[PDB]
Write a structure and sequence with these properties.
By secondary structure, the chain is mostly helical. The chain has a single domain (1-303), classed as Hemolysin E, Chain: A (Up-down Bundle), CATH 1.20.1170.10. 80% of the residues lie in helices and 2% in strands. The protein has helices at residues 2-39, 42-51, 61-104, 111-164, 169-184, 201-204, 212-263, 273-296, and strands at residues 190-192, 198-200. The protein has a two-stranded antiparallel ribbon with strand order 1-2. Strand 1 and strand 2 form a beta hairpin. Helix 3 packs antiparallel against helix 4 (111-164). The radius of gyration is 30 Å and the shape is rod-shaped. InterPro entries: Hemolysin_E. Belongs to the hemolysin E family. One of its GO terms (molecular function) is identical protein binding. This is Hemolysin E, chromosomal.
Length: 303
Amino acid sequence: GILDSMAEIVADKTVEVVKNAIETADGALDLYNKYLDQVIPWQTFDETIKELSRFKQEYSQAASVLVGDIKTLLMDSQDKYFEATQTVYEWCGVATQLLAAYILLFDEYNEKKASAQKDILIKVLDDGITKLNEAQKSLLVSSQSFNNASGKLLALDSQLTNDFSEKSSYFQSQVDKIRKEAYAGAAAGVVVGPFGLIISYSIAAGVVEGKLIPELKNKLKSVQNFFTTLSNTVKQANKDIDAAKLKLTTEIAAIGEIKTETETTRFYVDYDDLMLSLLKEAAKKMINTCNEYQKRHGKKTLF
């Protein structure tokens, strides 16, 4: 009959809205779970931060100051990324229990359980909008610190090019120290130079002319290359975090729009077996995303 046809269309509309609600929320979480946690090499930044003090006493005073400023700024970018992560973690801890209640409310269904499901899903979306907008502020400061680190790294590149050029007083003082050390290392046959360099007594003492400078230049180039590598990594990371932040603004707005349509949706509809599977499966998929995310970020128990 006519009434039945209308009921079926309303029920399919409800399934569509709900499935969209959940997938939209899950899609925003994946900008953290998949994009931000896996695309940017946070562990590489951590290992880098831990090693920036190596050979610190060997740099010129001016390069040393920039190295210290760069370390401090990368530490802040990491810090603010982990602050965004905790806020998202808080949303996940709540979303998982509410999505599990949602799935369970389908059992021995009735109008009260449908009304419970509707407000429970709306809370997941509302909490998501609130937490994701707070985390957006953290991502912006993470981004600003990567951008500031890029300016400092450009200034260090210019500083190191000066210091490491053959005519500078810094470079000349490095050679003079190796010459002095060559006499003390003659019996050993070995001379320990700058930035971990180890060279033979013959090279350090100039036994064959024109051979010490190139060896020293080679080692300094390796130091300069470490910072060019880091510079490339910071620039890419700044663009990727900005791209994630922009997609998050779009998805947070998409959560708000689907939340409004969910608010005017009847949940107490006749869900056939295929409709129940579609909704239950959507909710379970987001629960698995929340569990994978909280586990990566240290949660010890598994929901």
